[PDB]
């Protein structure tokens, strides 16, 4: 969360927490209801988001669903949607955390190495999280869409 | 390094489920504690030097340690002692803010035991000094946050002993 | 040829305001060629060595280390 | 003594050897492969 | 770090004798194996990434490890897993080229056990993955060099377990 | 090359060339005639190697030639044939030099970063060099195919 | 740092052309001279200290530079002179093996004139010392190997002057 | 051997073995019979080589056998011939190893320091290995004499 | 002492002791009687020195004995005189050591940190050691007063 | 690291008293020994290489250690042996100058035991070599300073065994 | 010298000269008269020192003058006596300067490398300085012989 990051910052600088970041933790504390609402709406409509985003990705980039591509077949397309499920789950975790660090710890360290192993094109995954971002911000109200799009934007930035 | 939030997310992540209502219950418990956690942290950050000097004046000052023959005799050892106490108080404040003693097990109590055995530091005097510091900060910042600091100081003592 | 060394090193001249437990207590793998100089450095720090251990060494081997 | 065991080395700004500061500044002010010249060849005797 | 040649020279050196005919017999045994050792090493070096991906696809993929709840869940742990497997295959190729498992006991199995206990890595899944990699490389490079890789993979498993 | 590598490896060690390194250079000097024969074999039949390897690659991996594939629209396939020609040229350089420092020091260092910036699947490039290796070692005698397949093997290994 | 092979490849690559017949002929010339280069390099590695001490015994000994006031006077200066001559012989051996003097102006002749001019080292006396080293090693390895050593010795003397 | 050195080279460069050094190990494997023959002939005539080389050394440099010198007396001359025995033994080890590294590990690291301790003139030892080289290459056929003289040449180069 | 410092200097420079510092240790050895006399006279009159210096300090700086100051009350003034006792004791140790290093090890490393903890003004302690210096050099003969004043001067220099 | 002077100051410091007359007695004892300590230290510093070579020629040379099969066989192990002996002699000279064996317990015998167990160094041969070096330096520098070196060499042997 | 060493040792420490170093310089300044007397004793009788020391050296170590040794022949023996003259001159410089930094900083740093490049046994050079020390301390009074033998002792110690 923001509190662990402020604590490791005050630890490496070997001082107490500044009143600026105490005010940051307090503002995060008061904005908990808005982030709960955002993560609530995202956990509500995860299937519709995944279905529309996967069909938009397959319409945009047909290489992955082509023969010889990565996600070819029923189980491979289902595993592709499972990976999109994991990434939307980490998006909700980072949305409720107030920080991008659980998304970093769980699903951003070695995604290039492991997708280099599986043969998955990583830019296709960046396009998938782009479509998930466009659909989820199409669902939300514009201010909350900006908040969720910050974390989605961070994920596609760490992808490509 | 995990908060109450990061430990909740971690526990829901190992078994593999999404956020359930009981996780939201723990999260709202953390928030309603966290407001007064912030005010107690500001109070401790304001008065840390007086807290440490009252802790050593309570327990360590007129004993054999601050006297000759103890491990707190020279000014080198006294400065190291005050620095050790300041670090205990600072990491207890971090654990109070995070709502999780994983930082105390991660950075404080990692190899502190064996260097305390190897340098010959008395564990009992340190534990007495930490407990004196505990009720000093309890009388300073209040009752409920005094209990908050109490379980984290007790976590440091249990990892030390 | 690697020595597992464990050593508690107090720095008496400076009261370091940071945590520095790794400068104080550490267990590390040193190569044999630099172990002599590193042991001399540790003794110049005065720090007591709890244990040394060698598991990659194969002692008694005149050829092939 | 300067960096220690756990610290990455960094750009020092040294004073007391009188050669040491302008040589360090002329060294670190350049980018890599800025030129082939050695910034000090040697120190002239006294 | 010793070859078949360096171990022969070492054994003749501890007792103190010169090279006898039985040492020359072991040396010619090493050479007549070493030609096909070279060709198998080139074949393994050519196809290492496919070997590792077939090994994990054989054993680790649709289990609880690559699933949530296992030690192979996150992408950090997956990348560490693929790196561990690549290192097992590379050091097995070095031991195959040298004709001696002293490198596996020297560099691989030195402290790998205790860090595998301390990080909570499952030993059984790793052993299954290494054995799957063993018959993958056996079907790739051939029968006799498959046995060569087999005893060195088995050396890694016996040092692991 | 071999001489560069031996000179540098003796050069860091502050010593002259050891006699074992010297008979290494001598054996490479004697085998240079067979190296030049393999180089003429690879040079003279580059048209059929590139053509048949591109045909077998697009047969094997049709999605990169398929809509949404990086290599789409005659010039994308044709452009790829130029990249395959580059890699066959580096194979010829590595065959002559007796070591892979031409191949690595020209076209294998930042190959991942370049093909990630272009949007290219690197596994399909490894399949392209695999088909080039199949056509090239189908074109020679046994030991010549082994000596050329060593460098082809290094290129496919340095891809993944 | 490039040998004859790497320079031929660099010319054909900066052209963007394939290796035509002139490049094939240049590489055939290098692959014919390489065995002689190898044997001369072994013979020079045999007698490094002898060639250096015979070069000093021919040129620099019993002159003014080993007397008081000379730049080769003290034992520190004598040891540094032997070190410099060993460097010249070693890098001339490297440039003989590569068949290209790119290592000489990359790693010897780069800042050598400015170093020697800042220290006060006589350049003519060290050029005569390198010439006597060339004469001794050309007496050692024969006519044509001595000539292909002396071309790089003359390269070092020309870049030094 | 050559295999340990190629392995530590591929280890420090953190890659697999190149097909050039795989071909080097294969050529070393095929040349095992020639090096076995060289070490066989050297282990055959070691006493004659040592006797002729020691008398040639004492004829060339009489300072060591003079009164006040190092090797003065029966036991001192016998220990001198014992040291020549150790060096010819390491020559045979390096001849059968294909590399100079066991000669380095056993008898080349601190010979200047230990002979600085005993009082042995090291250049006299270099002359002794020079006479052993001349006699052993006088015994061998010229190509095998070149191979053994490479290792002998390396020993006298590391001496002086 | 001077011998430990010369030993750690010869150790860090990794050489034997120079004849200059051997002559320094020998001169220190011969001057042992003079330093014994200085430390003898200081250990004789320590109470009179402390009483006159404490009253001179309280006459000079009355902030420490004022209400609200540090050394207020009977026990606080007695502890102030106890700290002056410790510093005169370390002065005698450094006088008999020939070096300032036991004064450094026992009472000069963290005096600023610990007196920041206790609330003691450190410049008042520097004034106290100044008065102890003035009184002790008033007691001694002028050459021995110069020697003791060197160590006293070092203590007040490390204070402020 | 303490002298006779620093140990006297330290002992008077732990109990907390000033310098008493018995401390002055120990200090004058140290000085009247220290003059001849200086002359013996200069004599040992002058002849250290001959002392070490006579020590190894006395005890270690014609045994199984300097022969094959011993831990002193190779030139690497011989150079390490001579370096170990030089370090024993140098630290014995430091302990003789300081008048206190705290340096031998501080820098020599700190972890020397366990590395001597782990490398397989024979303790008995080292102890014989040190005792041979002891009476070599006793016959060199004289009787009383021979006893001075004797108790410090014996301190090294007792910490070793 | 002593003044150079004291100035440099205070110079690295960023401090002035300590009073103990100052009486060190003062005692050396007073003992300079006896140093100049020892220097005139060593300077005026250099012929007999070099002659008798060369005679006793070649009596003690006859192998270096026997055919096969370094100093064999007229010119070579003249160069040997010249090297002994160099070392006696450096002994006189070190006697005047009060420290061994002239001797070390001129003729003892790379003495091993130089005499190894010339082919010279360094133990016989140590015996030459030993015989020079015997003749020189046979030429003076007691304390003068001790003060000169300190520098002779340093030269023989820096040989081995
Ligand atoms: C080929 C079978 C695969 C493939 C190829 C492909 N390549 C490109 C474009 C470029 N490729 C390079 C590559 C190199 N330049 C070099 O110098 C070397 C080493 C000798 C290599 C490998 C470069 C520089 C370009 C950019 C254009 C240029 O040539 O200057 C493309 C086009 C990418 C685009 O966005 O247009 C393609 C399609 N792609 C495949 O699908 C095959 C698997
Ligand atoms: C929370 C962090 C996290 C990530 C990222 C993750 C990825 C992940 N992706 C997998 C498979 C996969 N993922 C894909 C996905 C894709 N390929 C395509 O064609 C699409 C473009 C792209 C979808 C965006 C495919 C096709 C597979 C199956 C690969 C195979 O079976 O060879 C698997 C193997 C099956 C399993 O054990 O569940 C894992 C672990 N796991 C994690 O725990
Ligand atoms: C962030 C977590 C963390 C801690 C806590 C930590 C402690 C720590 N305490 C130390 C010493 C010490 N700690 C004490 C402690 C005490 N004085 C006493 O006698 C009492 C029992 C106690 C006072 C409350 C003393 C006296 C020393 C110095 C002993 C010596 O080495 O001389 C040292 C050795 C280096 C030094 O001198 O400071 C470390 C590394 N390091 C860390 O990284
Ligand atoms: C050259 C010899 C050598 C080896 C082998 C080696 C292994 C090694 N494996 C590690 C981790 C690991 N190794 C695995 C292994 C596996 N995944 C599984 O679950 C399976 C049981 C197995 C896959 C086959 C995992 C999951 C981790 C990371 C666990 C963590 O720390 O989060 C780590 C901790 C640092 C890291 O994260 O990589 C080391 C040092 N180090 C060495 O020097
Ligand atoms: C040998 C090295 C050494 C030093 C320096 C040292 C200082 C020292 N000073 C102390 C107290 C003190 N020291 C002072 C001294 C002063 N405040 C003033 O007003 C005066 C200006 C100044 C006197 C110069 C006072 C007032 C206290 C009591 C502080 C308190 O009780 O809060 C104590 C606490 C009592 C005890 O355990 O004896 C120590 C340890 N101890 C040592 O072992
Ligand atoms: C395999 C690596 C290796 C080497 C090099 C080696 C050298 C070695 N040379 C020795 C002696 C010796 N070596 C010599 C040799 C010489 N002095 C001369 O006059 C000759 C010119 C020169 C002969 C080339 C002499 C004279 C001694 C006896 C020295 C003495 O007893 O003082 C000894 C002492 C006796 C023993 O323990 O066997 C060793 C260990 N040992 C080894 O294990
Ligand atoms: C300042 C205190 C200090 C000491 C003493 C010290 C000793 C020390 N002795 C060592 C080895 C050794 N010491 C010996 C000793 C001997 N030869 C024998 O056989 C005899 C029993 C004895 C000769 C008297 C040998 C043979 C080795 C090397 C064994 C090997 O690792 O191959 C090593 C391992 C690194 C090396 O090769 O030198 C250390 C660190 N280090 C220190 O910091
Ligand atoms: C002031 C510091 C200093 C020293 C020491 C020095 C030595 C020195 N000694 C030399 C030769 C020599 N020095 C010796 C001396 C000896 N050989 C023996 O056998 C005896 C043990 C020993 C003398 C007693 C010999 C024989 C040579 C001639 C070497 C040769 O001709 O190869 C030479 C080469 C010719 C020359 O220019 O003189 C130098 C530079 N130069 C210096 O500037």
UniProtKB/TrEMBL annotation, chain C:
Sorted UniProt keywords: Antenna complex, Membrane, Photosynthesis, Phycobilisome, Thylakoid
Protein name, entry field: Phycobilisome 7.8 kDa linker polypeptide, allophycocyanin-associated, core
Signal peptide region: none
Function in brief: Rod linker protein, associated with allophycocyanin. Linker polypeptides determine the state of aggregation and the location of the disk-shaped phycobiliprotein units within the phycobilisome and modulate their spectroscopic properties in order to mediate a directed and optimal energy transfer.
Residues annotated as binding (2R,3E)-phycocyanobilin 2: 32
Native source organism of the sequence: Picosynechococcus sp. (strain ATCC 27264 / PCC 7002 / PR-6) (Agmenellum quadruplicatum)
Nucleotidyltransferase among keywords: no
Main subcellular location of this protein, as a coarse class: membrane
């Amino acid at each position: 969360s923001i509190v662990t990051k402020s604590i490791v910052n005050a630890d490496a600088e070997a001082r107490y927490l500044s009143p600026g970041e105490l005010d940051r933790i307090k503002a995060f504390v008061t904005s908990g209801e808005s982030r709960l609402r955002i993560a609530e709406t995202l956990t509500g409509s995860r299937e519709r988001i995944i279905k529309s985003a996967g069909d938009a990705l397959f319409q945009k980039r047909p290489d992955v669903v082509s023969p010889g591509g990565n996600a070819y077949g029923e189980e491979m397309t289902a595993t592709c949607l499972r990976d999109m499920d994991y990434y939307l789950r980490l998006i909700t975790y980072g949305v409720v955390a107030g920080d991008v660090t659980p998304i970093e710890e769980i699903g951003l360290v070695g995604v290039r190495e492991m997708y280099k192993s599986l043969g998955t094109p990583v830019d296709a995954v960046a396009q998938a999280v782009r479509e998930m971002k466009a659909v989820a911000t199409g669902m939300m109200s514009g201010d909350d869409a900006a908040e969720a799009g910050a974390y989605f934007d961070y994920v596609i930035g760490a992808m490509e | 390094m995990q908060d109450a939030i990061t430990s909740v997310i971690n526990s829901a992540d190992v078994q593999g489920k999404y956020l359930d209502g009981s996780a939201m219950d723990k999260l709202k418990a953390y928030f309603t504690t966290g407001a007064l956690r912030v005010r107690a942290a500001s109070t401790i950050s304001a008065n840390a030097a007086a807290i440490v000097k009252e802790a050593v004046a309570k327990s360590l000052l007129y004993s054999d340690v601050t006297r000759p023959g103890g491990n707190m005799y020279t000014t080198r050892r006294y400065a190291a002692c005050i620095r050790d106490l300041d670090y205990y108080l600072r990491y207890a404040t971090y654990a109070m803010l995070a709502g999780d003693p994983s930082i105390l097990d991660e950075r404080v109590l990692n190899g502190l035991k064996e260097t305390y055995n190897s340098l010959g530091v008395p564990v009992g005097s340190t534990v007495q000094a930490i407990q004196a510091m505990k009720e000093v900060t309890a009388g300073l910042v209040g009752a409920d946050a005094g209990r908050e600091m109490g379980v984290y100081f007790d976590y440091i003592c249990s990892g030390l002993s | 040829r690697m020595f597992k060394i464990t050593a508690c090193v107090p720095s008496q001249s400076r009261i370091r305001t940071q945590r520095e437990l790794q400068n104080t207590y550490f267990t590390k793998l040193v190569p044999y060629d630099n172990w002599f100089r590193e042991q001399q450095r540790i003794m110049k720090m005065g720090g007591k060595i709890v244990k040394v251990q060698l598991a990659t060494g194969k002692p008694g081997t005149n050829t092939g280390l | 003594d300067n960096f220690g065991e756990d610290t990455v080395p960094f750009r020092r700004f040294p004073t007391l050897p009188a050669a040491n500061f302008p040589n360090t500044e002329r060294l670190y002010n350049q980018l890599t492969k800025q030129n082939r010249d050695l910034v000090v060849p040697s120190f002239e005797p006294a």
